[PDB]
Amino acid sequence: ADDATSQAKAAFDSLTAQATEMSGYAWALVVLVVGATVGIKLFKKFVSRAS
Amino acid sequence: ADDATSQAKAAFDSLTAQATEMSGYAWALVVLVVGATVGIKLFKKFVSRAS
């Protein structure tokens, strides 16, 4: 049934938009972990600069 | 009687054409059950693909 594939198609479009919403939180979580590594690694840069 | 076998022959041809009409609905009913299994089993394929 091609009417059957219309029901499955609309639900797969809602599930892939759910994947872009959760993946958007994955870009923002690695935003805050990379903010920790840039701050901390500049602290170690000052360690070697005064050494 | 061979005239007797002419009456029985024509009624057996109508009964076997009735068997092809009902069997045609059996091909179409298993059309819609196999449409359910192809749709649903591609849903389970997406389950393992994102896993």
CA–CA dist A15, A18 (Å, integer): 5
Residue A9: C-alpha distances to residues A4, A16, A46, A48, B42 (Å): 9, 11, 56, 58, 11
Nearest-Cα distance to chain A for B45, in Å, is 12
Between helix B2-50 and helix A2-50 the angle, nearest 10°, is 10
Q: How long is chain B?
A: 51
Nearest-Cα distance to chain B for A26, in Å, is 15
Interface contact B35-A8, CB threshold 8 A: no
Q: What's at A35, amino acid-wise?
A: G
DSSP one-letter code for A31:
H
The resolution, in angstroms to one decimal, equals 5.0
Those residues whose C-beta lies under 8 Å from the C-beta of residue B32, and which sit 6 or more positions away, are A1
How much of chain A is helix, strand and coil, in % rounded to 5? 95, 0, 5
Q: Which residues of A touch B43 (CB under 8 A)?
A: 8
